[PDB]
Specification:
The protein is α/β, with parallel strands linked by helices. The protein has a single domain, classed as Glycosidases (TIM Barrel, Alpha-Beta Barrel), CATH 3.20.20. It has helices at 6-9, 30-38, 50-53, 63-75, 109-133, 158-163, 167-178, 197-212, 232-244, 260-279, 310-315; strands at 16-20, 41-44, 78-85, 140-145, 183-188, 218-221, 248-254, 284-289. An eight-stranded parallel barrel has the order 1-2-3-4-5-6-7-8, surrounded by four helices. Helix 5 (109-133) packs parallel to helix 7. It is globular, with a radius of gyration of 20 Å.
Length: 316
């Protein structure tokens, strides 16, 4: 093949990743070839979300997740696990009490204290089982995802209402204990802009962890970013700030969301961002492209026929 291997262009800056579907992983399939050719880091689009792994209490299905991991092993890609604890794509059973009522709806102080304990157990068991299964095979775990409201207050999810603010630290310790080799990330969107309240809440929390000894290695910036905003300057201060805490940064779902002028504009923004990422490659340990957009898993980069798009030539 005559075009450059994307991940090679970024050697000794950072790995380049994509999220995949377990259906698309056969040698027969050009998708799988495009993945193996261009990327050296992989995430499960959905196979490792809570609802995928533990549909019912204590019932696990690892089929698709295993296929994805095996794919990474074969091609020697870094595996991101996504995600251990989240308020979305999480089965209802998790948050039901003894009788099968919403735990959230409990008023009695003695029973709440009992619900708290069951949820901690459930959270930790899920963590131990999943991280335990994949022990040593996972470059980085997204241990928690989207813990913040956009205003920078903690999200009032079931996790938070029942366990209270501790669930996060608890998820991180349990992950650390199950697989010490895995980098532990806290992931979110709207945390690219240093001036944003959210980005600052996340800084404060992470700082707190680093100072209190709570294991955390990295912050995951989703990187749903527009053409003009946030400014490269604003992003830079964010990278500097977190890197000052001694945590790594990953861009976990990079996306710069029709016509011929449209494409060339997005390609230039991407050029710019990648310039900025390269400038700070010491602080950044992976860039994964968002890819649900049928369009490829890296829709920014490769057309529906697997041909390079403007954006791809912009960054190589």
């Amino acid at each position: 093949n005559d075009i450059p291997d994307l991940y090679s262009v970024f050697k000794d800056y950072f790995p380049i990743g994509v999220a995949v579907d377990p259906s698309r992983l056969n040698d027969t399939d050009p998708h799988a070839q495009l993945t193996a050719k261009h990327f050296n880091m992989l995430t499960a689009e959905n196979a490792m979300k809570p609802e995928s792994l533990e549909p019912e209490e204590g019932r696990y299905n690892f089929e698709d997740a295993d296929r994805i991991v095996a794919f990474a092993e074969k091609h020697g890609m870094k595996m991101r696990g996504h995600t251990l604890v989240w308020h979305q794509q999480v089965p209802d059973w998790f948050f039901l009490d003894e009788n099968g009522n919403p735990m959230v709806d409990e008023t009695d102080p003695k029973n709440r204290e009992a619900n708290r304990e069951e949820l901690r157990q459930r959270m930790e068991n899920h963590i131990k089982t999943v991280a335990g299964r994949y022990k040593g095979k996972i470059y980085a775990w997204d241990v928690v995802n989207e813990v913040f409201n956009d205003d920078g207050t903690l999200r009032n999810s079931a996790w938070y209402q029942i366990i209270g603010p501790d669930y996060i630290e608890e998820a991180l310790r349990a992950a650390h204990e199950a697989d010490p080799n895995a980098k532990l990330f806290i992931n979110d969107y709207n945390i690219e802009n240093w001036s944003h309240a959210k980005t600052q809440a996340m800084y404060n929390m992470v700082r707190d962890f680093k100072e209190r000894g709570v294991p955390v290695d990295g912050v995951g910036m989703q990187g749903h970013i527009s053409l003009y905003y946030p400014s490269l300057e604003e992003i830079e201060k964010a990278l500097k700030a977190f890197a000052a805490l001694g945590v790594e940064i990953m861009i976990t779902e990079l996306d710069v969301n029709v016509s011929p002028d449209a494409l060339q504009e997005q390609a230039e923004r991407m050029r710019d961002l990648f310039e900025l990422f390269k400038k700070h490659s010491d602080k950044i340990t992976g860039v994964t492209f968002w890819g649900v957009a049928g369009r490829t898993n890296a829709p920014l980069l490769f057309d529906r026929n697997y041909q390079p798009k403007p954006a791809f030539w912009a960054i190589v």
